Amino acid sequence: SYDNVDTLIEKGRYNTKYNYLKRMEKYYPNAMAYFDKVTINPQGNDFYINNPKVELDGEPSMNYLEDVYVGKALLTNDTQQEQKLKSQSFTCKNTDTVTATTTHTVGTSIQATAKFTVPFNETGVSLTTSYSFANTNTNTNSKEITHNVPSQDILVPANTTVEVIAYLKKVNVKGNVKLVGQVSGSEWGEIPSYLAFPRDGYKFSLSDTVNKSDLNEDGTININGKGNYSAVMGDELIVKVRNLNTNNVQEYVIPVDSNIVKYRSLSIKAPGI
Amino acid sequence: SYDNVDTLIEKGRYNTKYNYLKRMEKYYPNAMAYFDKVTINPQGNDFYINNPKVELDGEPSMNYLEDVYVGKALLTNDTQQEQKLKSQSFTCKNTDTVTATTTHTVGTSIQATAKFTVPFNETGVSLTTSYSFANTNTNTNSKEITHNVPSQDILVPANTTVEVIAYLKKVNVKGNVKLVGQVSGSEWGEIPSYLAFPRDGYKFSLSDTVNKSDLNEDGTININGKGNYSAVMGDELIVKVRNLNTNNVQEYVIPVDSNIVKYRSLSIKAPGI
Amino acid sequence: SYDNVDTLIEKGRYNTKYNYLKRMEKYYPNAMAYFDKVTINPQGNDFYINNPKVELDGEPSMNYLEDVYVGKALLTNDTQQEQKLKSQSFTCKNTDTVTATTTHTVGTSIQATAKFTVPFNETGVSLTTSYSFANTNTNTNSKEITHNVPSQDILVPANTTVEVIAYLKKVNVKGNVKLVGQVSGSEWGEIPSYLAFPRDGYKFSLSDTVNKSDLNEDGTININGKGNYSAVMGDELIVKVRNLNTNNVQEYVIPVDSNIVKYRSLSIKAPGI
Ligand SMILES: [U]
Ligand SMILES: [U]
Ligand SMILES: [U]
Ligand SMILES: [U]
Ligand SMILES: [U]
Ligand SMILES: [U]
Ligand SMILES: [U]
Ligand SMILES: [U]
Ligand SMILES: [U]
């Protein structure tokens, strides 16, 4: 259980080149001193990260960022009794975005990717990016959403005008992910024959660079990288209605009903009932 | 109907210099090849953009940005009945600003300007800048506003203290303008006499660089540039009162009544009536 | 009363070097002309700023910046009568920070510091930094706060589900400080003997570089520097409950009860009572 730079672990080439000169120490006593005059030429691998998944390192933090104005309406009840009065429908085209960086890669050597869906729906519109395990990429996805607020029925007391403001709250969800998976496989190369020294075909596994305890059953080895994200997305649609005689304001959420969000038609009471 | 770089269109000097060498093709067959050995020297113009107006390319977007704290008050009713209790008056000096850039000029050659008033009043205080049609200028205007909230009468139930918070909502209105107008007039210059070549006084209109269809009646030609803006301005003044026994909060807008905004004196009910 | 660069005032070395050559004008008429061939070597001081205090140059400005989501809860009353229903407790670890710069030092020469506590408590958690009088330092202090919201009792009408959102308002308090205090003391040095010129041990006070009127009783002299700040801190904890039949939302402040803020357990009415 546990490991973070595939690249540092692949320096178990160091093992092949050392043990190599160690045999040669019998044939010539100054063997170790030739450490860098002897080149070691990689020629391939089947290195692979299995079941790459991104997951939440910590809980997400959420801030209510801004409110988007969506619409306005005066509704006028010049009657001696209370009336149901209909507001107009609105359309807001608003964009939900997320941007996602890899902060600590998992080594550079082996490529991998994994989708991550933003842990905040609240509208019916999900949002996904991905992370690259092996370089520090900033990827950015997004989605235009059209919120269709239909007419609302608003009870308005007698001799009251009423101001109706509608707005879409936005929320900014930030957090830290960990990139994880189970690395397998081997490299094969050659320590080419130098002067008196013999050629040496090699093949090391990554299993054999750590410890049989750290290693799993199935033979792979766990890796972790780091990554952050920051998304901005719609939350509730609010309708605030204000009675222009008393100036009291009452607040209402208009609930939800591709990339088109339709909202319920509600009947709601203005302050003064 | 339609055109965007006066400057590209003024390269109907190219027309005068070409047609010029075209006549000379009879007298000498290698005329076109002297295209850049022959200089063309402008000497004046009465180019002019008529009725320059800025106008809204798209609807404005509005975000409720921040709330400015304006004041606080505890109001205490240690009586066995409900009392009208007066809050203190406040003054807030707050600044409404707008900044405005030209994003795609209309060509560099001819100067023009046009005022633009920010499409959001909501306080009694308007805000205007302008755009330069011919260079990418950022201009910034602003206005200090002093909001004078008088004493408010607050009904407070028996044996209730009440906390009153007042604040000014700010709103951030951003959008895209288009700079428009009707260009007229001409340039006059000279293709000075070179070696065997004769001098050639010229005068071309801008009308004669496009197409009689695109041209208007009156003879001018329509132009468009681009421009954005971003203003931050006051919207409603809110008074929130909280009943300290139940902790319910009720919300109220205090309506409006040079660069001094006076607000109404309202009578309002604390939660608990 | 009044003074702002100790450093400009210490150029009453200029006084010692001038008056010095003024005596020499008798012995040789071209004395003033040697002004910079004569070196003046400081060797010490007991300069000191007494009772250094930071204080508020203007009132603070406060913006409600963002709301931190703290928790969510559905509470369901599938009974034919009204029920008290308990929400779950939450923990929010949130950080209150302040950053503070010195904008106009008070001269570079003499060191001093003074603590400044942020003029906004509202949680039970104060916040302090300091200012350096003599260089333009940005210092930043902060405090993790854990807000412990216990279970709340929420009256919920019959056949009503109810959504409960809890959030912590943050506020951004910015303003300008003035760094003040009463400077005392002296420098002593030497105008070393050059060619025909005699050595001259000196000791000037700072008192004797301005005017006996500006000077105080006790002999010191008032100084002022400038400095700004910007803190971000928690204000009220809000619980908003929404009745899912009518969609009305009522709002509530949950009042406060080291770096651990415990909150009251309230009994509150959902909309619909
Ligand atoms: U995991
Ligand atoms: U919700
Ligand atoms: U509100
Ligand atoms: U237009
Ligand atoms: U309004
Ligand atoms: U509120
Ligand atoms: U003072
Ligand atoms: U408060
Ligand atoms: U609210």
What SS3 string covers C70-87?
Answer: EEEEEEEECCCCCEEEEC
Q: Which are the contacts of C230, defined by CB distance < 8 A and separation ≥ 6?
A: C98, C99, C100, C172, C173, C174
| φ and ψ at residue C27, rounded to 5 degrees | -65, -30
Please give the backbone phi and psi of residue A183, each rounded to the nearest 5 degrees, phi first: -75, 135
B224 residue type, one letter: N
Q: Resolution of the deposited coordinates, in angstroms? A: 2.6
Name the helix (H) or strand (E) containing C27.
Answer: helix C13-27
B98 class by beta-carbon count within 10 Å (0-12 exposed, 13-18 middle, 19+ buried):
buried
- Is residue A226 within a helix (H) or strand (E), and if so which, with residue range? strand A221-243
Rounded distance, CA A139 to CA A133, Å? 12
Q: Hey, what are C197's tokens?
A: 């010129």
Cα–Cα distance, B17 to C251 (Å, whole number): 76
C-alpha distance across the termini of chain A, in Å:
64
Q: Does the domain spanning A1-47+185-219 belong to CATH 3.30.360.60?
A: yes
Q: Residue A195 to residues A24, C20, C90: CA-CA distances in angstroms?
A: 13, 85, 72
As a whole number of angstroms, the distance between CA A108 and CA C96 comes to 38
CA of B80 relative to ligand 2 center, distance in Å: 40
Instruction: Give the residue from A59, A214, A232 showing the smallest Cα distance to A143.
Output: A232
Contacts of B125 (CB under 8 A, 6+ apart): B96, B143, B145, B233, B234, B259, B261
Q: What is the 3-state secondary structure (H, E, C) of chain B?
A: CCCCCHHHHHCCHHHHHHHHHHHHHHHCCCCHHHCCCCCCEEEEECCEEEEEEEEECCCCEEEEEEEEEEEEEEEEECCCCCEEEECCCEEEEEEEEEEEEEEECCCCCCCCEEEEECCCCCCCCCCEEEEECCCCCEEEEEEEEEEEECCCEEEECCCEEEEEEEEEEEEEEEEEEEEEEEEECEEEEEECCCCCCCCEEEEEECHHHCCCCCCCCCCCEEEEEEEEEEEEEEEEEEEEEEECCCCEEEEEECCECCCEEEECCCEEECCCC
Closest CA to B215 of B202, B205, B225: B205
The residue of chain A with its CA nearest to that of C69 is A62
CA-nearest of B107, B122, B110 to B233 is B122
Q: Which CATH superfamily hosts domain B48-184+220-273?
A: Proaerolysin, chain A, domain 3 (2.170.15.10)
Contact call for C252 and B249, based on CB within 8 A = yes
Query: Is the CB of A252 less than 8 angstroms away from the CB of C247?
Result: yes
Which one, of C149, C154, C158, lies nearest residue C270 by Cα? Answer: C154
Question: How far, in Å, CA of B128 to CA of B30, rounded?
Answer: 58
Question: CB-based burial of residue A247 (10 Å sphere; 0-12 exposed, 13-18 middle, 19+ buried)?
Answer: buried
CA distance A160 to A75: 8
Chain centroid, CA B226 distance in Å: 11
Show the DSSP H helices in chain A as ranges. 6-10, 13-27
Domain ranges in chain A?
A: 1-47+185-219, 48-184+220-273
Which tokens go with C13? Answer: 């070395």
Q: Are C84 and C202 in contact (CB under 8 A)?
A: no
Cα B128 to Cα A82: distance, rounded to the nearest angstrom: 42
User: Encoding tokens for residue C28?
Assistant: 């040789």
CA distance A223 to A48: 11
CA-atom Rg of chain A in angstroms? 32
CA atoms in the 13 A half-sphere facing the CB of B38 = 25
- Cα A229–Cα A259–Cα B177 angle in degrees, nearest 5: 85
The burial of C71, by beta-carbon neighbours within 10 Å (0-12 exposed, 13-18 middle, 19 or more buried), is given as middle
Distance CA A215, CA A3 (A): 10
CA distance B194 to B36: 12
Neighbours of A266 (CB within 10 A): 17
The one-character DSSP state at C88 is P
Structure determination method: X-ray
> How much of chain A is helix, strand and coil, in % rounded to 5?
10, 55, 35
| Chain A: residues touching B (Cβ < 8 Å) | 66-69, 167, 242, 246-249, 251
Spatial separation of the C-alpha atoms in residues A114 and A256, rounded to whole Å? 31
Phi, psi of A33 (to 5 degrees): -60, -15
**Could you tell me which residues come within 8 angstroms of residue C77 by beta carbon, excluding any fewer than 6 positions away?**
C83, C85, C156, C157, C158, C159, C160, C161, C162
Q: How far apart are CA A187 and CA A43, in angstroms?
A: 8
Q: Do C251 and B251 touch (CB under 8 A)?
A: yes
- Name the DSSP letter for residue C195: T
How many helices (H) and strands (E) chain A has is answered by 2, 16
Q: Could you tell me if C117 and C247 are in contact, meaning their C-beta atoms sit under 8 angstroms apart?
A: no
Interface of C with B (CB under 8 A): 61-65, 171-172, 250-255, 266, 268-269
